[PDB]
Each structure stands twice: as structure tokens, then as C-alpha cells.
Design an enzyme around this catalytic site. Structure first.
Site, PDB file in Angstrom:
ATOM      1  N   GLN A 128       0.748  -0.956  -0.072  1.00  0.00           N
ATOM      2  CA  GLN A 128       0.143  -0.037   0.173  1.00  0.00           C
ATOM      3  C   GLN A 128       0.804   1.630   0.418  1.00  0.00           C
ATOM      4  O   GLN A 128       0.193   1.866  -0.101  1.00  0.00           O
ATOM      5  CB  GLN A 128      -0.959  -0.159   0.753  1.00  0.00           C
ATOM      6  CG  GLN A 128      -1.339   1.578   1.480  1.00  0.00           C
ATOM      7  CD  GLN A 128      -2.984   1.906   0.653  1.00  0.00           C
ATOM      8  OE1 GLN A 128      -4.090   0.975   0.848  1.00  0.00           O
ATOM      9  NE2 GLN A 128      -2.386   2.512  -0.800  1.00  0.00           N
TER      10      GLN A 128
ATOM     11  N   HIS B 162      -3.018  -2.186  -8.512  1.00  0.00           N
ATOM     12  CA  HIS B 162      -3.552  -1.334  -8.239  1.00  0.00           C
ATOM     13  C   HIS B 162      -2.911  -0.680  -8.525  1.00  0.00           C
ATOM     14  O   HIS B 162      -1.779   0.326  -8.780  1.00  0.00           O
ATOM     15  CB  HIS B 162      -3.152  -0.494  -5.660  1.00  0.00           C
ATOM     16  CG  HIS B 162      -4.347  -1.155  -5.473  1.00  0.00           C
ATOM     17  ND1 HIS B 162      -4.533  -2.399  -5.150  1.00  0.00           N
ATOM     18  CD2 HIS B 162      -5.452  -1.029  -5.276  1.00  0.00           C
ATOM     19  CE1 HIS B 162      -5.431  -3.008  -4.514  1.00  0.00           C
ATOM     20  NE2 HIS B 162      -6.006  -1.516  -4.284  1.00  0.00           N
TER      21      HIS B 162
ATOM     22  N   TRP C 142     -12.825   4.670   3.832  1.00  0.00           N
ATOM     23  CA  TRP C 142     -13.152   4.532   2.497  1.00  0.00           C
ATOM     24  C   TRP C 142     -14.419   4.381   1.352  1.00  0.00           C
ATOM     25  O   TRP C 142     -14.240   5.079   0.667  1.00  0.00           O
ATOM     26  CB  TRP C 142     -12.354   3.490   1.497  1.00  0.00           C
ATOM     27  CG  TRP C 142     -10.146   3.901   2.397  1.00  0.00           C
ATOM     28  CD1 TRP C 142      -9.956   4.963   1.423  1.00  0.00           C
ATOM     29  CD2 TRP C 142      -9.887   3.460   3.363  1.00  0.00           C
ATOM     30  NE1 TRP C 142      -8.131   5.154   2.586  1.00  0.00           N
ATOM     31  CE2 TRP C 142      -8.676   4.211   3.048  1.00  0.00           C
ATOM     32  CE3 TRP C 142     -10.163   2.645   4.456  1.00  0.00           C
ATOM     33  CZ2 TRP C 142      -7.708   4.027   4.600  1.00  0.00           C
ATOM     34  CZ3 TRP C 142      -9.246   2.557   5.200  1.00  0.00           C
ATOM     35  CH2 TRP C 142      -8.573   2.878   5.199  1.00  0.00           C
TER      36      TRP C 142
HETATM   37 FE   LIG Z   1      -8.220  -1.505  -4.117  1.00  0.00          FE
HETATM   38 MG   LIG Z   2      -8.362   1.744  -2.555  1.00  0.00          MG
END
Ligand SMILES: [Fe+3]
Ligand SMILES: [Mg+2]
Ligand SMILES: [Fe+3]
Ligand SMILES: [Mg+2]
Lengths: 423, 423
Positions: free
Chosen positions: B153, B211, B316
Site C-alpha cells: 500500500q 492497483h 473509504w
Molecule cells: Fe483496492
Molecule cells: Mg483502494
């Protein structure tokens, strides 16, 4: 007959409440300090949320339920929709309109909707759909208060006898005067059509609901005339501007200037999320604009805005079950009203704000009002929206007119377990 | 034990079908010329639609179920979400991750989802969430085949020991190598991070799920490197580019050139409609872009694309019940896949296309495959989507693992009438 609604939660209020009923009206509302026992003549909300009925401020009952007849709209475009509707012309009769309108109205009753405003196309010399809808209005009255908008779909000045037909519709009983300025041949016809609309509303003492600037054209500014005429006549409460999707494309400086007038005028705004996201942005390639009016900014400015379904199961919108929580869900996402409070307060967009748009005089959980209310099996607006809950009970005049026994879901793990989607 | 599924409708097929089961597998599928009678050991689909299980190709089980703990995200922004998550740090433990992941997994089982790919943040020297998720994977195996993506991340090159931690996660058993090039400090780190990701996937024989370009930046083109490296290594089937929301903002000429490579590479694409419409377009004022990747064009070009939920009930994305038909509904609207056939074929975006994205080797209603299938109380994909139907039965290994008794709605008119929202 029902005498009380117990263990009710109310938006914005702490704790549980008891709603006393008498002679079809709400006699009193009292706070409870704990959970009350059930008993004969008591409807137990079971700590669910009690709110006045859902409202549908903008739907087209004259075209509903026709998708796929005789053919389906395969591209999904507006253009093809018009063609598919034209192929069904031989089936458009008095009885056909009544049958289809009633089918959607029954879904609405099931979904706790007790107030509906339907637009009816009056750009038809025979006024076939209007005559049918006027009968439907009388027939459905025990369950839904239906308002009919005389909607000159092909324009007032741009269609033969458009103004005469619009007035004829009012003489026959339509409740609201419609217009569609951006569809008129010229900007001048657009502005003139609004003067004619307001003159008719004042002549017959009717409400106004304009299909206003429903186009991705940054120069479509008919909304300023709608607001200015309402302010001049001191009739903002009786006026609504539907769609205003062009506002999504205006520059910010003009929008800021315009907002002062919108607030001062007191007019209402309807956004139709399911249809707007589908039909707006169709001339863009990439990036593609969302095309919904400035809902978030209207709320921040205290301008009344609400949500409608627009179309149900027809050539222009193939989907829908006439469910307002589903309409709200789409609007919150596209308008980015995704903070906890914004979502929780979302119920106002399909209840109180819509009641104001329809100029309703008997609406809300308050002593003296008719006992019209619905019960959602949820803790608050956020919970109801997240779980897309059905209407457990719909009460009108103090009597139950609809009820939904919730689905029951079980997963078979080491042992069976009931799943309610709550944490 | 169940021996047959009778009176089943299949997407794209005419009539009714019988699915014979033996030893936990599908032994044969035969057409029926009429409705078959029920009997012991027969599960009656009742002319409902039978399809292989729904799939969740992209979710974050490590953050699920934390919305409002200890505080709610009131603005709904990404920035505030990060802050709200940080305030919950003291509660992030091994047991907490397992409890929350299992809560969402149970909703998924209830929703007919038997295949799930979860990203797990591995930018944490303690790898707390990863260790917990590896146990959850084993525990949930009888009901869901869970794939774990080691998701760096905070970046691979832009976080201390990022590459070492990513590899450690693979050594511990993560099934898929993740990356996030647009979040790296520089474009050069972004490109280099992808070379490292592919080298790790080849070293450990794992899948890849990046991502990729999740940002409204027309210059974010990491997707071309993902596709080029996959083509070079001849491993497209094992590679996925998640999000690619930047593609919504690319000029058309570059996109056309790029599409040739995307098709040739054979890589997979995941779009996350509920989250993309919420978090993309946040830097625009008006008009506001939708921000979802080019799903319609991918489908027209034969490029495999599918839909994920992304986040469920967290900072989120505050909403969700982990329902794939709800994800599909949002995607069809925002991507303007609203023609009848486009909607009806929509089920592929949450079944077959997602199975391909996960590189599944035992998926589909075919002889020889494990008897994993679900039954929807609807006539076809369009009907299931329009009415947002629940999963009537979920079958895995020839045994029922979930069932939903449908809600029952009644309206009280002159006489009571059942409402099923069908015309
Ligand atoms: Fe994701
Ligand atoms: Mg995300
Ligand atoms: Fe309309
Ligand atoms: Mg319309």
C-alpha cells in the site's frame, strides 16, 4: 382500529417514541424511557424508523411498463428509445394507459409511497393519456394522492396548438402546468414559453413544474427565468424546476450569481439520479461528465432539492421497481454525498424535501396531521439506505395499506446462522 | 445428498435444463422439453436462473467493517478516511482482523459468492493483517476459496523495506503479488516497481494484481508497462490491472494505440464501480468526470474486464452489504451499458469474467466440474439485475451452503394482493 405506534425511532431524535392515533389522525407524540409492551391495537415499530411516506416527485406513468414492447432498446440510447416507443403506437389506448399506470402505482404503494407527481404528455390532440390518468387519479386516491402535470413534451410554441392543448389539459383538471424550454426551436421561444406557463398557472391557480435545461449545454439557462418569474409573482413555493442537468456544466462564476436568485425565489428542484446518469454525458467521449444538477451545493445553500425516479421499465429507462431508497442510493454516489451525516440525512431527499416540492399541506409526523406514516426495519437513515430495506408497514389514515415480511437468509457453516447484514 | 438440479434456466440458452450431480461434481447436463416434477434429492430451481457462483475479484478484508470506529468519516473524503483509520490503530490486532474479515465473508457466503480475492496491506513490518488473513483463508475454505494479494500500500520503492516485506509476504503464502505504481514517489520508481513485481511473480510462480493508475491523471500510464511485461513473459492470464481509472481521462488516440497491446497481452481488468464513482472526480469542480475505466470499450474489443466491490463498510466506502448484483447495477449505469442485451449480459461481469481474472481452473456449469452453482429467483440476467434478487440457494460440492426465503410483500386494496415487482 390501530390506536398507537410504539417503540418508534424518529430521524434526528434520541430514543424511542409513541405515536397516538385517533380518528385517522395523529393525536399526540410522546417520548418513551424504555421499550413498551405490545398489545391489541398497537403496531410495534420494534425500534425501527418511523417517517412520513416516501414521495415520488417526478415520474412518467403514461410510458411506464412498456420496455420491450414490441422490441427492446438494444443501444440504450434516447434516440432508439423514441423509435421503440413509436413501434408500440397501435397499443396506446385508454385502457392500456390505465393498466400500466396502475401496475407501477401498486409497486409504489408496496414501497411506502403515498404521494406521486406524474407528468403526462399533452402534445396530443386526442389527450388520450391525460383522460386515462385523470380516471386513475380518482381510482387510486384511497392509497396515493396523485398530482398530474400537463407536460407539453413537444414544446408549447414549437408544436401545433401546443398552448391551446396545454390550457385544455388544465381545464380538464391537470394539477400542474409543465413546460420544456430547451426543446423549443429557439431560445426566444423558450423564454416566451415560460411567460405563457406562468400566466396559465396564475389564471387557473395551479402549480408549475418545468422540465428545465435537461441538456448538457452550458448555454441552457432557462432556470434563471423560472426563478425570476416565480420571484416576481411571489409564488416560489408553487414552482419546481425539474432536472436542470445543464447546471452541471455551468462555469462557477455564473452559478454563484444564479444561486442568490435561486435562494431568494424559493423555487424547488428535482434531480432524477437513475435517469440522469444514464442519459446525460452521451455526447462526451472521455472523460464523461456525470450530468446531475448541483445537489450538494443546493443543500449547503438551503435551496430545496429532492430526488425522483423519472421513468420505470420503459424505452428511456429499462430498469426500476419504483423504489425511492434505490433512487437515493444512486444520487448519494453520483453527487458524492458520502459522508456519514450526508448519507443519514439522505432520507430528506425522498421525504420532506419532496413533500415541499409537491406543496403538500398535510405531511409529517406531527399532532393534527393525518396518520400517514411508514415503518422501516432499520435504525436510522444510514442503515436503511445501506441495507436497502423494504417498507415493513405503510399506514394511511391510521390503517395498514401495505406490509412486507422480510426475507430470511441462512448460511450453513458448522451450524446454521441467520444473516441480517448488520455488524 | 442432492442428485439433481431441475427446471433450471441457463444464460444464453433456450428452455429448461436438468443438472445431474454425482460425487460432488456435475456429471451431466440435459435439456428438458417441459417442467419436471420435484422429488427426493432434487433441488427445484423453479424456472429460476442457475449460474456458477458470484465472484468478488477485489476487496479489502483487512479494513472491512470499521466505519465509525471510533469516529465517522463526515466529509466522506479519502483524506478524512485515512485520518479516521489512524484513530483506530489501537484496535488493530490479529483477532480483530479475523473477526471483521469473517463478518464480511459470511455476508459473501449469503450472497452466493464462493471465490474472493482480498488485498492485504503488507507495508507493515509486523505483517499483522497478513498473518490473520492466512488463518482466515484456511478457516473459510469449505465455503469460499480465498486468494490473498500481498498489497504494498505505501509503495515498493517508496516505503522502508517495501520490497523485502513484499517478498516476505509471498514466502508466507500470499497467492498474488501486488503493486501501486502511481503512489510511488516518481514515475521511474513506478516503472521499476513493476519490473520487481513481475520478477517476484516468476520467482514464486504467483499471480499479479496491480492497483494500476487509480488516479485522475492523464499522464498515469503504468498500465502499458503491466501489459508489456505480461506479453514479454507470456503470462497475461496470470495478470490483472485493477482500477485503471486514469484511462477514463486519456485522449482517444493514445487509448486506441494502447488497446492493441491490451488485447495482445491477454491481461485482466477490474473496475470497482461503487468506490470509483465515489472517490474519482474529487478534484474536479463542475463538470465532474465519472472516473471508471473504459469498460464498454473493453467489452467491445474482447478484453476481459469484471467488477469488484473494493471496500465494505469502512472509512473509504461507508456502504455495502457485499452484494455483487448491487455492484453490477452501479457499473451498468455509470458505464452506460443500458441497452437490454448489455444489461442481460451484465452477469458475466460478476461471474465468468471474474473467474478468468482469478485464473480459476474449476468454474462453470459443465460436466466434470465441481458442483458449485447458485440459483437466482429470476428469469434471466436482466430480471435478476432489475429486481436485485437475493440468492435462493448456493450449492458447493453438491451441498446447500446458503439459502434465502424471499420477502413477501402485500398491498391491501379492495382485496389483498401479492406484489412481486414483475409485470
Ligand atoms: Fe483496492
Ligand atoms: Mg483502494
Ligand atoms: Fe420527466
Ligand atoms: Mg424525460
Amino acid at each position: 382500529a390501530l390506536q398507537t405506534i410504539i417503540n418508534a425511532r424518529l430521524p434526528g431524535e434520541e430514543g424511542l417514541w409513541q405515536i397516538h392515533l385517533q380518528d385517522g389522525k395523529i393525536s399526540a407524540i410522546d417520548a418513551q424511557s424504555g421499550v413498551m409492551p405490545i398489545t391489541e391495537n398497537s403496531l410495534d415499530a420494534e425500534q425501527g424508523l418511523v417517517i412520513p411516506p416516501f414521495v415520488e416527485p417526478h415520474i412518467h406513468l403514461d410510458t411506464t411498463q412498456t420496455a420491450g414492447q414490441p422490441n427492446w432498446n438494444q443501444s440504450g440510447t434516447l434516440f432508439e428509445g423514441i423509435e421503440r416507443w413509436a413501434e408500440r403506437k397501435a397499443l396506446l389506448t385508454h385502457d392500456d394507459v390505465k393498466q400500466r399506470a396502475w401496475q407501477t402505482l401498486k409497486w409504489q404503494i408496496a414501497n411506502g409511497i403515498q404521494h406521486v407527481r406524474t407528468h403526462v404528455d399533452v402534445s396530443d390532440a386526442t389527450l388520450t393519456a391525460l383522460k386515462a390518468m385523470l380516471e386513475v387519479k380518482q381510482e387510486v386516491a384511497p392509497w396515493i394522492d396523485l398530482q398530474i402535470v400537463a407536460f407539453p413534451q413537444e414544446g408549447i410554441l414549437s408544436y401545433p396548438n401546443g398552448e391551446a392543448l396545454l390550457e385544455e389539459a388544465l381545464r380538464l383538471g391537470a394539477d400542474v402546468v409543465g413546460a420544456i424550454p430547451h426543446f423549443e426551436f429557439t431560445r426566444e421561444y423558450g423564454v416566451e414559453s415560460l411567460h405563457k406557463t406562468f400566466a396559465l398557472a396564475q389564471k387557473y391557480d395551479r402549480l408549475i413544474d418545468v422540465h428545465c435545461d435537461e441538456i448538457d449545454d452550458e448555454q441552457s439557462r432557462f432556470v434563471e427565468t423560472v426563478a425570476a418569474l416565480a420571484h416576481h409573482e411571489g409564488m416560489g413555493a408553487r414552482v419546481t424546476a425539474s432536472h436542470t442537468t445543464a447546471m452541471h456544466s455551468y462555469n462557477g462564476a455564473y452559478t454563484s450569481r444564479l444561486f442568490r436568485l435561486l435562494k431568494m425565489s424559493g423555487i424547488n428542484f428535482v434531480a432524477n439520479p437513475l435517469v440522469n446518469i444514464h442519459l446525460q454525458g452521451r455526447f462526451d467521449t472521455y472523460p464523461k461528465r456525470r450530468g446531475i444538477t448541483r445537489v450538494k451545493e443546493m443543500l449547503e445553500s438551503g435551496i430545496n432539492v429532492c430526488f425522483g425516479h423519472d421513468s420505470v421499465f420503459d424505452p428511456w429507462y429499462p430498469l426500476g421497481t419504483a423504489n425511492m431508497l434505490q433512487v437515493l442510493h444512486m444520487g448519494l454516489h453520483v453527487c458524492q454525498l458520502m459522508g456519514y451525516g450526508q448519507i443519514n440525512d439522505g432520507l430528506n431527499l425522498i421525504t420532506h424535501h419532496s413533500a415541499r416540492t409537491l406543496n403538500l399541506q398535510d405531511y409529517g409526523i406531527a399532532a393534527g396531521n393525518s396518520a400517514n406514516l411508514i415503518i422501516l426495519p432499520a435504525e436510522n437513515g444510514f442503515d436503511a439506505l445501506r441495507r436497502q430495506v423494504p417498507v415493513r408497514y405503510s399506514v394511511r389514515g391510521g390503517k395498514v395499506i401495505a406490509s412486507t415480511q422480510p426475507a430470511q437468509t441462512t448460511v450453513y457453516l458448522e451450524q446454521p446462522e441467520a444473516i441480517d447484514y448488520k455488524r
